Nucleic acid binder design. Structure first.
Lengths: 87, 81, 97, 25, 206, 96, 129, 216, 121, 150
RNA sequence: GCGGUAAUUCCAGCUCCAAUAGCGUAUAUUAAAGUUGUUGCAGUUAAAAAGCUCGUAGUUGAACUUUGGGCCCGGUUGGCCG
RNA sequence: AGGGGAUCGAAGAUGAUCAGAUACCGUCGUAGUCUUAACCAUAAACUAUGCCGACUAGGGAUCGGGUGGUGUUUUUUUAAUGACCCACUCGGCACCUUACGAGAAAUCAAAGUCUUUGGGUUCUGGGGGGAGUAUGGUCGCAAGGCUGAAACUUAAAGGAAUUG
């Protein structure tokens, strides 16, 4: 639901996964949020700028989270040759 | 394995997979353009012929069929088609 | 209560197996459910080995032994302590000592 | 008791009832 | 978008080849790993050194992004890795655990050995399984120095390496330390190679 | 397929199956067989009338030890004999 | 042996969605399957799908987004009126504002909202939410 | 004194984490109840059943009271706590700590037209504990809460005034029924909708920058 | 059975870890320092404390212990750990290569001074 | 499937995606059509004609190198047998099994297999009568089977 | 389930409840009952998969045939409109 | 009703035991196992898991068949083959990850894809007894098989763990 006449509602929109795009629950104590820094032409992890990949407990317990992180980083440009799309 | 290229598989993977299990089924067979020594007797033969075919000249059987691919004679010049 | 996943025997996709009975009591057991053991026995059980060596015409022999197939009942095997009553968790130990 | 012997007893009872009814009619 | 200075270099390639980390597990492998390519007969399972280095630099980036080395924590139980984690604790913060990992560490907020690490590094999951399950309980990321025959379950960043080789395990641990220190600012001479060598990662029997 | 048919033309089979399986319930079976009308001794009535015959001192069932002291009643509409409880404390001398 | 190819395809879609996989291969790609996939694409529920036209029957390859909880088929295709579609949409969907139960009617293939707007009913096939 | 020993507790001391919504967003595991009772003081605690349970020992029965209690605030958040203790008061205290640790948010939605404040649940949800399964579906405004008295009371503490519940199995097991309701609440928060399809990205949280000022 | 109680065990452990530099190897002065550094309600108990203290120090002198010793144990661990085997001999000098050893680096595109040396069979 | 068994084995040919390929042989469709009619006159069933042609000459498929099917062209040219090949071979199997039962009545496995074979014969005959390739009232009999097999 | 000599349960005196001239009991029936289950039940061990197979009625039964585009307008929209 | 009826072996002929052994455990032994004319159709006939279809948890040596390998040794080494190994299989018989799945739980690659409930069908059950007992109807020479209640009685019967 979404109201036109203002009325900010639906407090605490849940944080949403980036691996399988599914949701991350309120107390799923397995969900991780990889926070990997950005290097900008100086070999330095300049503070205050990172990129986030959210991995859920379902993916964790399935065990493909490694390949999911590789493909996410490669699509985002963070990694170069970890994961080939044509498997 | 959660995200995979089902659009285009690798040649090695497709060869490993069953012929009927590919994206579009294709026969694992081919034509063997085969020839017996002496007279040409040029005739293309199925790989899984299932028959002991011979040229019209004389008893010169070129295939001795087995369960799968058919065995050829001692001296046969064969080319893939 | 299914106490055993294999139903206490070795029979899957076999229908019926002709039995050979125990030698102590011959209680009703099919041959797969039996406790068939390869019983290995020395001639003197390493008791008169010096007498064997001294009285052998040709000394330092390999000294072989006797091998037999003992078809043992479940009840008789438990009674004679051929098989041990194990716990539920380690009842799945396939490899014997 | 044992259901096998219950079955045996009821079969014997059925046989007796059948014989009695046959003789009575 | 990288300045292309983190690519593989001949010195590190020769180091990896000399310590023989390119050989992973036996013919039996885990289906979740595409790292092995053209593994040859005799069990030779060849590991991709380029992918190993890419996972290595990714792990270095993650532990450099974490602000607190005190919060960063490494786990090791094998004797082949205890010396490595102590060397890591000497090189940077990376507060390690030596010997057995006591259950109830990351959980059980009342125990004396309670840690809360923002991320966990494990060397061999088959021996340090307790750590990965506790990390899964307390929702923290974990890098594992996985083998081609490893339980990659509950693992974020899998390093393609060998766990049967002391030389390989010490070498990969040293590159972890060197890469994090270089990305943090301890080793600013990018062109010049680093002060030590991974022969520190060893153990004299007498 | 969950057992039962799931076709658009299986109404006959579903109705027949329900009709046959309805006989497994005691209430429906008794209602449609009329056992309360014939086999029950009240003739399918809430209340009945009869003539008291004698006194019965049947004992209680365990764990209990008391005499209920009911009466024997021969009904009027059908003549069947029944045993009728006398509920209250000292109603035997009234329903003698 | 193969009664509802749409049911088999949608069960494969559900299995992939529950596993988390981002793509599915579907046999044998009937035209009602294609129309259902088209409706899902129009509503933004499945993502993308490509029809591999082998000469036998065709295959459907689907790139999924985790936007889809689970779809299902309603077998048999019940003959429904307007009140009937009201009952079906009250029964099969989590809420009233979202969720689309789909039925074939004379005016092509469409969800219950479009069927109501066009003021026509048909036979219900499945639901998406 | 309070002095909790946990990163959450120390962050709450510092006041950097100021919202129960903020803690629920990152799902950071909670280890104390003082944090919860300071963050949401408008909570009400009510117990429905404390039950004796007997362990037969070689001479007699050892009786311990198992207490199940649901506690939360009348807007959006409740939780349940089970614990067995020697005394009724101790069992109530243990249930209170466990429930305050297990407090969970609730996704309250509209039956339709989204006119005023939320009155029902968002999507039909199920929760199964053991054998009893309880499902909650959105009631229309004004109907009320239709449930067995325990689930009804849980819903009053939940704050949603309109919901229908369907139950199957042995609902007379109060502990399992309440846990099933809890899982159903968790699931109805965990469901997905286009309003959640909306723009997600959510870049780096201030967690790293607020993790520096902890004691250890 | 001659092994003592865990309470006195912890007492000895804590005393050692808190006043290791004060105490010495000699057993008599061990007793006569423990009696004044630690309050113990039994002369027999303090005797057992000092006896196990000198036993554990004798084990330390002839035998390694993991962590219950002083920080001088950590000091000697870091002095002995960073002890190079004399010189850096045998280090990479043996580079010899083979077919597969070539194949990997040729695939990754990082050329190496390899020398093809297989088994001469 | 495997109508009259419990096996689930899949062993079938995989026709290629080719529609008219390789179109290299200089002998036109007249040559292949005369090959099939000559062999059918020689007295082979269309399955045998097809396999013999396929393994003797270079043919992707009779369908793709002609305009029609093998049985289609045989029916048009009048060389079609009085009964279809499937029914013919089923009846041959049935008469062989019937003779075996007559020789050894004690073969209960053979009796069961006989019933199973006649089940297929009757179902296939019903299909043929429904599709109107065979005339109505045509029934399989243990007596007339001996006449039809030869 | 209570009552076997401290019965909160029986009989009786003060207090309380459904209701108010209306309540109690009996027999049916509906909700309860997702214990008749089309929605929507179970069949390994709680009752229940025919000993196995064939087969008529019955139920169900690969995929494909105009899938496709351009302009105008009788009619709506809290409308980028008070 | 015939053939073997050698040997064992329902029924039947002994003792430490007895208040009782006509029960276990000695010996012997009728009926009783292969087969003419054939019946009988029951079993814990069990995987207590209907059949036909589609997708899914370290996973190998495998059983039948097929494909490829400086592939291994030889026969008649360098001119087939058989056997072996390494990979891919197609088809059929089995299981331990605190399974994210299911189940009350044992446990289950199905007992999953079932309150987010619908792939197609057949059969069976509706608390425990009475009772698999029927006046009845069918098959059988019989024993008996199939079908199959009700009156009445009862608040439990039962399943899976968990405490001695």
């Amino acid at each position: 639901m979404e109201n036109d006449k203002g009325q900010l509602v639906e407090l605490y929109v849940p944080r949403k996964c980036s691996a399988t795009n599914r949701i991350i629950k309120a107390d799923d104590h397995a969900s991780v949020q990889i926070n990997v820094a950005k290097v900008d032409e100086e070999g330095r992890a300049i503070p205050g700028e990172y990129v986030t990949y959210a991995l859920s407990g379902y993916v964790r317990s399935r065990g493909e989270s490694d390949d999911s992180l590789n493909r996410l980083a490669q699509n985002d440009g963070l990694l170069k040759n970890v994961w080939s799309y044509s498997r | 394995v959660l995200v995979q290229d089902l659009l285009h598989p690798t040649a090695a993977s497709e060869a490993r997979k069953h012929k009927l299990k590919t994206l579009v089924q294709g026969p694992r067979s081919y034509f063997l353009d085969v020839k017996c020594p002496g007279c040409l007797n040029i005739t293309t033969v199925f790989s899984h012929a299932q028959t002991a075919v011979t040229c019209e000249s004389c008893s010169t059987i070129l295939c001795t069929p087995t369960g799968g691919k058919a065995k050829l004679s001692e001296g046969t010049s064969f080319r893939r088609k | 209560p299914k106490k055993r996943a294999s139903n206490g025997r070795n029979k899957k996709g076999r229908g019926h197996v002709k039995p050979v009975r125990c030698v102590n009591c011959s209680k009703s057991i099919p041959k797969d459910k039996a406790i068939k053991r390869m019983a290995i026995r020395n001639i003197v059980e390493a008791a008169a080995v010096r007498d064997l060596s001294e009285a052998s015409v040709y000394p330092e022999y390999a000294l072989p032994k006797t091998y037999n197939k003992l078809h043992y009942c479940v009840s008789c095997a438990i009674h004679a302590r051929i098989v041990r009553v194990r716990s539920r968790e380690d009842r799945k130990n396939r490899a014997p000592p | 008791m044992r259901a096998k012997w219950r079955k045996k007893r009821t079969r014997r009872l059925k046989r007796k009832r059948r014989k009695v009814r046959a003789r009575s009619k | 978008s990288l300045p292309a200075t983190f690519d593989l270099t001949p010195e590190d390639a020769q180091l990896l080849l000399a310590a023989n980390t390119h050989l992973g597990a036996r013919n039996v492998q885990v289906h979740q790993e595409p790292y092995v390519f053209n593994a040859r007969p005799d069990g030779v399972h060849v590991i991709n050194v380029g992918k190993t280095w890419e996972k290595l630099v990714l792990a270095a980036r993650i532990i450099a992004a974490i602000p607190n080395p005190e919060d960063v924590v490494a786990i090791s139980s094998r004797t082949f890795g205890q010396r490595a984690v102590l060397k890591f604790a000497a090189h940077t913060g990376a507060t390690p655990i030596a010997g057995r990992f006591t259950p109830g560490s990351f959980t059980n907020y009342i125990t004396r050995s309670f840690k809360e690490p923002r991320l966990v590094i494990v060397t061999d999951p088959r021996s340090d399984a307790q750590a990965i399950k506790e990390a899964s309980y307390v929702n923290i990321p974990v890098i594992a120095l996985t083998d081609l025959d490893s339980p990659s379950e509950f693992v974020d960043v899998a390093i393609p390496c060998n766990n049967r080789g002391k030389h390989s395990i010490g070498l990969i641990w040293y590159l972890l330390a060197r890469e994090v220190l270089r990305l943090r600012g301890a080793l600013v001479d990018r062109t010049q190679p680093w002060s030590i060598m991974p022969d520190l990662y060893f153990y004299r029997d007498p | 397929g969950k057992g039962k048919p799931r076709g658009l033309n299986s109404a006959r089979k579903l109705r027949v199956h329900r009709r046959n399986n309805r006989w497994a319930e005691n209430n429906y079976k008794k209602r449609l067989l009329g056992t309360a009308f014939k086999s029950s001794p009240f003739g399918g009535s809430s209340h009945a009338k009869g003539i008291v015959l004698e006194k019965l001192g049947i004992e209680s069932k365990q764990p209990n030890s008391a005499i209920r002291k009911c009466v024997r009643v021969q009904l009027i509409k059908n003549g069947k004999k029944v045993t009728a409880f006398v509920p209250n404390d000292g109603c035997l001398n009234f329903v003698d | 042996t193969r009664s509802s190819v749409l049911a088999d395809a949608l069960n494969a879609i559900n299995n992939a969605e529950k596993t988390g996989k981002r793509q599915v291969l579907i046999r044998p790609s009937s035209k009602v399957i294609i129309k259902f996939l088209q409706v899902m694409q129009k509503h933004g529920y499945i993502g993308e799908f490509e029809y591999i036209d082998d000469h036998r029957s065709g295959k459907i390859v689907v790139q999924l987004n985790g936007r889809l909880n689970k779809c299902g088929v309603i077998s048999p295709r019940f003959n429904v009126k307007i009140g009937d579609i009201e009952k079906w949409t009250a029964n099969l969907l989590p809420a009233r504002q979202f969720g689309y139960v789909i039925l074939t009617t004379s005016a092509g293939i469409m969800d219950h909202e479009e069927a109501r707007r066009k003021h026509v009913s048909g036979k219900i096939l499945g639901f998406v939410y | 004194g309070w002095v909790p020993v946990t990163k959450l507790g120390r962050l709450v001391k510092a006041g950097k984490i100021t919202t129960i919504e903020e803690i629920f967003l990152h799902s950071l595991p909670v280890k104390e109840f003082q944090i919860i009772d300071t963050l949401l003081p408008g909570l009400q605690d009510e117990v429905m059943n404390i039950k004796p349970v007997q362990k037969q020992t070689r001479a007699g029965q050892r009786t311990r009271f198992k207490a199940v209690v649901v506690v939360g605030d009348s807007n959006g958040h409740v939780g349940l706590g089970i614990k067995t203790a020697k005394e009724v008061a101790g069992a109530i205290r243990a249930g209170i700590i466990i429930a305050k640790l297990s407090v969970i948010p609730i996704r309250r939605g509209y039956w339709g037209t989204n006119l005023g404040q939320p009155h029902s649940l968002a999507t039909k949800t199920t929760g199964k504990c053991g054998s009893v399964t309880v499902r909650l579906i959105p009631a229309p405004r004004g109907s009320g809460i239709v449930a067995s008295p325990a689930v009804k009371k849980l819903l009053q503490l939940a704050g949603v005034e309109d919901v229908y519940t369907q139950s199957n199995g042995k609902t007379r097991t109060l502990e399992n029924t309440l846990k099933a309701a809890f899982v159903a609440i968790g699931n109805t928060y965990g469901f997905l909708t286009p309003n959640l399809w909306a723009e997600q990205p959510l870049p780096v949280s201030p967690l790293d920058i607020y993790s520096d000022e902890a004691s250890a | 059975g001659r092994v003592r109680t865990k309470t006195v065990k912890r007492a000895s452990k804590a005393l050692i870890e808190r006043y290791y530099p004060k105490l010495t190897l000699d057993f008599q002065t061990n007793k006569r320092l423990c009696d004044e550094i630690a309050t113990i309600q039994s002369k027999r108990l303090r005797n057992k404390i000092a006896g196990y203290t000198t036993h554990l120090m004798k084990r330390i002198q002839k035998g390694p212990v993991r962590g219950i010793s002083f920080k001088l144990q950590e000091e000697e661990r870091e002095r002995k750990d960073q002890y190079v085997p004399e010189v850096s001999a045998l280090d990479l000098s043996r580079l010899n290569v083979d077919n597969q050893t070539s194949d990997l680096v040729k695939s990754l595109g990082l050329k190496l001074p390899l020398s093809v040396i297989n088994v001469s069979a | 499937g495997r109508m009259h068994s419990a096996g689930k084995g899949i062993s079938s040919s995989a026709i290629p995606y080719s529609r008219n390929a390789p179109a290299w042989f200089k002998l036109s469709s007249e040559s292949v059509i005369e090959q099939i009619v000559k062999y059918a006159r020689k007295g082979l069933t269309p399955s045998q004609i097809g396999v013999l042609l396929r393994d003797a000459h270079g043919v992707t498929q009779a369908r793709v190198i002609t305009g029609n099917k093998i049985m289609r062209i045989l029916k048009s040219n009048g060389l079609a047998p009085e009964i279809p090949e499937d029914l013919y071979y089923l009846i041959k199997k049935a008469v062989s099994v019937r003779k075996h039962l007559e020789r050894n009545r004690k073969d209960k496995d053979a009796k069961f297999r006989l019933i199973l074979i006649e089940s297929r014969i009757h179902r296939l005959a019903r299909y043929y009568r429904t599709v109107a390739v065979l005339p109505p009232n045509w029934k399989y009999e243990s007596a007339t089977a001996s006449a039809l097999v030869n």
